[PDB]
Amino acid sequence: SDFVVVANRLPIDLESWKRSPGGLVTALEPLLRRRRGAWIGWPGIPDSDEDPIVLVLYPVRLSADDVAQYYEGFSNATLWPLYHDVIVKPIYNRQWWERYVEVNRRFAEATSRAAARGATVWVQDYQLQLVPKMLRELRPDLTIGFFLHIPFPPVELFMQLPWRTEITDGLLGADLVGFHLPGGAQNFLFLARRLVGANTSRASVGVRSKFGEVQIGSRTVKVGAFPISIDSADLDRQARQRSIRQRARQIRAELGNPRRILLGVDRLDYTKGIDVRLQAFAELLAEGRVNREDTVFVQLATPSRERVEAYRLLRDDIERQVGHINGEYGEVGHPVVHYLHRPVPREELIAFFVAADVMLVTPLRDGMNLVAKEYVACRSDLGGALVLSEFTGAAAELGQAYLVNPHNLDHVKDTMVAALNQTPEEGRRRMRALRRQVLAHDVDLWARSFLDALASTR
Amino acid sequence: SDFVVVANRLPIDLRSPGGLVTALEPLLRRAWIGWPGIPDSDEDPVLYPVRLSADDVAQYYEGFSNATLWPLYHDVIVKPIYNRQWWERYVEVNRRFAEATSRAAARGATVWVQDYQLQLVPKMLRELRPDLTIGFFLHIPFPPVELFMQLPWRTEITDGLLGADLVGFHLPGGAQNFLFLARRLVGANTSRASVGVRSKFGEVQIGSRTVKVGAFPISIDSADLDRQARQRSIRQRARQIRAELGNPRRILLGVDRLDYTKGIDVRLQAFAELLAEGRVNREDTVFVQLATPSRERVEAYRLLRDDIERQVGHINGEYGEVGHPVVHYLHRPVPREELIAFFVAADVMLVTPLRDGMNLVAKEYVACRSDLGGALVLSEFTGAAAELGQAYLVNPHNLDHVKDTMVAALNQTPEEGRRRMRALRRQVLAHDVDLWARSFLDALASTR
Amino acid sequence: DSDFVVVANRLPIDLESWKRSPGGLVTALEPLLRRRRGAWIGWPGIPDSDEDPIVDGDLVLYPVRLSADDVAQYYEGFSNATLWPLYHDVIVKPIYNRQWWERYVEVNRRFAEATSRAAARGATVWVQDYQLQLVPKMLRELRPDLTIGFFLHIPFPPVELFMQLPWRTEITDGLLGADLVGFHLPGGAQNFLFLARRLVGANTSRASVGVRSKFGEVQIGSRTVKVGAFPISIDSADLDRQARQRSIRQRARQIRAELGNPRRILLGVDRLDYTKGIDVRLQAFAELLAEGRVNREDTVFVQLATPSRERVEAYRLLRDDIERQVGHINGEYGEVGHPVVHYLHRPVPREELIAFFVAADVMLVTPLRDGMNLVAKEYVACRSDLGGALVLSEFTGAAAELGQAYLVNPHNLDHVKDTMVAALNQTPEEGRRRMRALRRQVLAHDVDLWARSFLDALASTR
Amino acid sequence: SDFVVVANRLPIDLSWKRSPGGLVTALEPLLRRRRGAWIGWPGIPDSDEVLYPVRLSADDVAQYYEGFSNATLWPLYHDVIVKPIYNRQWWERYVEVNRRFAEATSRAAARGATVWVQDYQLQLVPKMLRELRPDLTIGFFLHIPFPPVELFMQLPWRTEITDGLLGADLVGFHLPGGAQNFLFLARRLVGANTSRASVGVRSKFGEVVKVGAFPISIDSADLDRQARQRSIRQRARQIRAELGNPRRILLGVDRLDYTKGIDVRLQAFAELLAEGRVNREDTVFVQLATPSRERVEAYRLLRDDIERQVGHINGEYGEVGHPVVHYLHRPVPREELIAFFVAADVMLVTPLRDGMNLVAKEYVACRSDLGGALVLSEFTGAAAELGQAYLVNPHNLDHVKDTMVAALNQTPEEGRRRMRALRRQVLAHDVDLWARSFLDALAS
Ligand SMILES: Nc1ncnc2c1ncn2[C@@H]1O[C@H](COP(=O)(O)OP(=O)(O)O)[C@@H](O)[C@H]1O
Ligand SMILES: Nc1ncnc2c1ncn2[C@@H]1O[C@H](COP(=O)(O)OP(=O)(O)O)[C@@H](O)[C@H]1O
Ligand SMILES: Nc1ncnc2c1ncn2[C@@H]1O[C@H](COP(=O)(O)OP(=O)(O)O)[C@@H](O)[C@H]1O
Ligand SMILES: Nc1ncnc2c1ncn2[C@@H]1O[C@H](COP(=O)(O)OP(=O)(O)O)[C@@H](O)[C@H]1O
Ligand SMILES: O=P(O)(O)OC[C@H]1O[C@](O)(CO)[C@@H](O)[C@@H]1O
Ligand SMILES: O=P(O)(O)OC[C@H]1O[C@](O)(CO)[C@@H](O)[C@@H]1O
Ligand SMILES: O=P(O)(O)OC[C@H]1O[C@](O)(CO)[C@@H](O)[C@@H]1O
């Protein structure tokens, strides 16, 4: 293989198979499926095999302890809570870190058994931050690039991590290190100067331009900001099949023809602000500011990481909110909140985007968020309204949505009422400006921006 | 007035909640000393008002009555709180009830005291006015004596009740509990035989007076509930209710106050497990729970409400579709005709309390099904199970058996359902609230 | 083939190297089976042990192997998270679990199979306590030639709560395979005869049952099951003499010196168990200090708590609330170098425990419920000087023999605090009167008297 | 008066008693020198009013003080250790109470006077007092950390707090980090022209109004002479004998606050004892903790957790008559505290986040003998001046433990060496050096 991708997930998921969750699959699978090459990742279950399925995929077998301590543990109960501004208190555990080190080392060695000479390797995300340095040690001929799909925290918080130095050096084994936002890339150059003691650049980093540099002995490390997106054009087009439109109409009938339909779509994850949108909706019903008989909210929540107790805690609290709200304001035969805890099939989800008057995307912190960009591409009729949290990476590109600080609950409620009350002229004006950005900045633009930057490092 | 009823509150709120109100109201219609249901009330009256300060409500009503005695008499489902400041308020407020009873009573009058919040009234009243004839009926269970002895004030609770001429319970086993405490804790000479149902009553010597003790199981005004359930408006609304749920094959009903004695959590776990096991189709079966809010300034009541709402949102998320939940859950009282329409539409009635002195909801259902369909699933730990043996009786802690019993009731032959319904309604119609009042009062009058 | 075999879940030793096993079941029965020959079946305290027998000096033991899943679902599960909480008036909510019921069934069978191997033709078997209540019916089915006794060391709950158990019938059936069923008290005996007429439809004697006399009866076809009340005790005279040793009496003087010679010492000694009232006695102590009614400079409370069943979640929650109380009181009322509460979370050696009984001015025994409770009797036997004061919860079985203690309802905290103040301030004249009356009972009603009339009642069924 | 100080706190707390916290420990004697004026709150509801006290209702205490100040601002400014609460009623209170502080400042102020308002409870008063009295000079110093921008932007009232601060002529922080976090904000949030370069300590300021970094210290020489008293040295010995003459003493001293890391040192100590690496017979830990904000739920929950650790370690490794941890939940008198500083072989200073921490500086100034050792958390402002302490990251429990073993068994020579350099710093950079710096900038 002249070209290898390394990520924890594969594009499939074993139960028989299934699509893997998350936006890294949403974006990489359409891109790489078009590109013959190799992919290394975990089959989503413990103690599988290492036999490939044919592009070419290589499964990494993880033991029961690898999953609990590197995946559920160091990755999702240390790195994840902390990188999103310690929403949940992180846990610092030495056995999780020791297992983190060892799994990353097995990934670096699976890449080597795949990476031909001089090949181009591309490593993905927070679970695999030591692989750049490990892989260079084994394999100094490779061109290595790394993209983090989650935010990179402020310096004062990253320094909590007992292994702050080994994570930084792990990332600097690559030739190019990328982030969604210039904010993440500037956090990084700071931490390189003020922890590993390297010479870094001092200007600010640009979007797909004005890249920074770190000087590591006899090597030079490039740093950049590359905001990911979706395969905008296929989705825009898939949303125009007569079947989807006719299905959107049937959805609103199955609900008893409300005047306004509000929607949320997310993995069930404490970053996502699902609890914020429910509380704001409940206080709006309480205040008589929405009509409880012709207005309804649907929440499509995908189960995620449910053996982590911070997720089961969140699940318990969100379920309580749904029975509470319906208990007070619904009628028999007529909830005001419809709550579903499973992954919807792609075509059924597109109908929901089309049926929805108001999209609710309220994360407390999010590296990017592709649900926001998917809704915008699905509305070639220019109806709808996107209520967008400013703590997402998308608010930097989607300025024409209605933008909220999710911690100001009055601002959330105010902005929900305005989106419900927008004029046709105002809603179409915004949906046009938002659609023009998303169609121009798709996943193609993002992938060619990163790998042309990586190619220059040679 | 020559006939005086004494109860915690009055028959309208500011209709009233509980099984005490949906019983004594139709009777009475054919003085009343009670609390408005509000703080610092006025004082004008025939009704007599008892004003409670903000602190009487918290320490006498919400504290002692509903966070000490209520959980204790119900087999300590929730840990009871023994608070001597609550006891002192309880005593005080009991005294205003006795005083205003005296201001309303005539020389030689009969008085009738109701339920667990006024247990000291009889003895206080008997001292103020030994010319009165006094009755007392407890509408909640009487706990076993190894648990009643926890009370720091167990001797004083028992002394108050003995200021009466007739002490009454729903059940014999409660009447006999009370005679044990009369013999051992107050040392009085008591009867030793078992007590019958409205017969074979017992007695306790207290000076030159004999206290009658007995068992009188409360009921509903059966025949009236039957005729109102036969009307076209009700039957048309029951057809329509089922259409608004998308025409289910099978409907199950829970109806109760949101209280930790009622087993709303049990019927939800059993129903979620059945859905998980494929033993009930999530497409044509549906459950409606109608929960009246209750005592939510008490924190054990909020803790219960949070986890039932958690249950509702969890079961719908796993088995429901958008536009079709499998559990509809309402947290408000329902107008009386609307409720009767749900008794008629309901194929299976789930009454699964962990402990209940007497459940009237299960007899209301019985009385509403003159078409002889439907099915009653009934906790043995209600006083009602002693009269309604032809229901589907369960121990609500035997969860496998609870789940088994709901399937059998959902899947009965109609001939079997009609046989059981025929037997239940013979009992309920022959033993209404009118049987129960004349029975108690023919015994209270017997002590002159 | 032994002509006399005792079977209990515990053995008198526990493998961690051997230590003495916990509980008052072991304190009463051990010194008795060194005297008499016989066999003892029990579980060695860990899983996946072997079956080879053990040399306890003269005593000889049969270990019962349990797998890890036997420990979790039978021991930790059904016994101690279903039976223990429910028999103690649902102080904690029992968990009703059919798989725990299934493995409680399987293990009772394992214990009955191991006794049958050991019992000779015609032997006497004495089965102990709540872990093993299906064993008698199982053993009578294997071995109709056997004389079966069963004793329940914990209380037997009122009928209204025992009915909550989905296996109420099968537990009552399993006790009725015995030739004699014994309890501490007549209350427990009278509940059982009520459940037998009510549940299994048997014909039952309906009169009161007396103390080691006035036995009840249960008709099982052609077999008749005797029922009685037998209040366990300790080795009263041997403890009294152990306490008279110089070495024990100077350790007592030295204990008080390392506490800075307080004027008053208060002591509690129990397994860390939520039936024990340790939270109660710490709450009362703290409020007496707050109110100024006990002197913080010359009074100190010592609590000796042995870890118990620490893998059951209710027991870890209890542990953490109590440890919270300890730090809270010492930080409010203690000085640096001088706490007002001393707490140790480990078993104490027996000669060290005796010296604490001797040094202690007030013994605090405040369970919310206890089938009997032997610490109250152990303290009394030690105070041959006639000093000391016993504060005893009336919900302990021992309160029916120890009426001259300072008796409290633990739920009446105001009264508990007043009774603690009066015990600390009693005249010498008044404490000797009570201590002298308490010791007259304990020395006359010892463990020999208890086992003698239980077993002679058993041998009266042949 | 021509110098008016405004803080939530007075120097006495109500019978008048010493006020808690390090803001007063430094500036109580520092300003007992030059006379002036001071606007504060007596620590008690409804007070009737040199010192000028502000009165608060029972609603203003709950919502402005227990609520917005210590349940919104304090958790957020300390790296969201606790989840902050964002309640608009608290915020409307906080506005109205700041208004009253500013108005008492206004009667107390004459024309041209100097004002110096103190701490996070009063960030709106610089703008309020300039609109009211444009003649005054106004300075402000923040005594807690100033949070990273990604966190501060959570605040629904982010723009108002930045504008209440920009009402002053000089804004001061302990560290250049807070000084530079605050310059970015003024650019980004309010849209002002700000300087770009690193701010240095007491120099190389920024501009929008002057922005500077001013590390607060203590009154270093007065504590040192107070620590050498024969009376203090005899009590230190009396204290060691009262514990059974241990071979080593460890000492923690702080308010009972979740920022202080008291739980971290209890856990490290419990594990060293389980591992056999500390001797349960000759080594003992003393923790002196002052109650703080105990009507606020997150503090009562901390309190419960820490008491449980104390009960758990003693029942595990203590013997009857001899705990391993003595824990005291009351403020100690000054003379007896200093005696504890002199007795202790190791000082445990493990905040998860602290704006400065003067307890470390206090211990350093007491040990004129050069004995002792100071284990200090790197997330204190002090760690920037006390680099020869034994520095730890308190989230690395394994390193905290290793460092407690090395400080407990240091050579006398190693110990004296670190302590001579520590005293060199603290003796030369004291409370008065700090004050002359800010006010020169302010007077500029
Ligand atoms: N309940 C759901 N059902 C079906 N698809 C979902 C559901 N929730 C999320 N998705 C899809 O998963 C992907 C999540 O992408 P993204 O919004 O960037 O967040 P993340 O990667 O953190 O999960 C999207 O493509 C989204 O459409
Ligand atoms: N959600 C509800 N809506 C309308 N009526 C209710 C509701 N819940 C209970 N009731 C009525 O309140 C009365 C209470 O009946 P009962 O079984 O004796 O229990 P309790 O006295 O403990 O409330 C019944 O008549 C019932 O019909
Ligand atoms: N901390 C302890 N150290 C040593 N022995 C103890 C300790 N706690 C209890 N014991 C002993 O264990 C036995 C407890 O018996 P008992 O009071 O009947 O209650 P239980 O069997 O429930 O534990 C007594 O013999 C007592 O002396
Ligand atoms: N238990 C205590 N007894 C006496 N003084 C204390 C106690 N705890 C803290 N102090 C003093 O309070 C002051 C506060 O110290 P500091 O480190 O500045 O933190 P903060 O200002 O947040 O309270 C110090 O001078 C310290 O000596
Ligand atoms: O944790 P999961 O199940 O892999 O899914 C969530 C996905 O979202 C991401 O966290 C986005 O960073 C992916 O790394 C991850 O694969
Ligand atoms: O053996 P355990 O479970 O550790 O507890 C101690 C003892 O207390 C008892 O429950 C007393 O009945 C014994 O059966 C038991 O052996
Ligand atoms: O005044 P309190 O509520 O006791 O707080 C302690 C002190 O901590 C400080 O932040 C010191 O940094 C002061 O602002 C405050 O007075």
Author numbering:
A (entry chain B): 10 to 24, 32 to 70, 74 to 477
B (entry chain A): 10 to 23, 35 to 50, 54 to 68, 75 to 477
C (entry chain D): 9 to 24, 32 to 477
D (entry chain C): 10 to 23, 32 to 66, 75 to 233, 240 to 475
What does the paper say about this structure?
OtsA is a glycosyltransferase that uses the α anomer of G6P as acceptor and NDP-glucose as the donor to synthesize T6P. In this pathway, which is conserved and essential in mycobacteria, trehalose is synthesized in a two-step process involving OtsA and OtsB2 enzymes. MtrOtsA is composed of two Rossmann-fold domains with a deep catalytic site at their interface, in an arrangement typical of GT-B glycosyltransferases for other organisms. MtrOtsA forms a tetramer in solution, as previously observed for M. tuberculosis OtsA.
Although we did not observe any effect of F6P on enzyme activity for MtrOtsAs, we nevertheless attempted to soak this compound in both apo form and OtsA:ADP:G6P ternary complex crystals and also cocrystallize it in the presence and absence of ADP and G6P, all under CHES-free conditions. None of these conditions provided a structure in which F6P occupied an allosteric site. We could, however, observe F6P when cocrystallized together with ADP, bound to the acceptor substrate site, with OtsA presenting the active site in a closed conformation. The structure obtained with F6P shows this compound occupying the donor site, in the presence of ADP, with the enzyme adopting a closed conformation. Nevertheless, OtsA could use only G6P as an acceptor, and F6P showed no effect on the enzyme activity, indicating that the presence of F6P in the acceptor site was forced by the high concentration used for cocrystallization (5 mM).
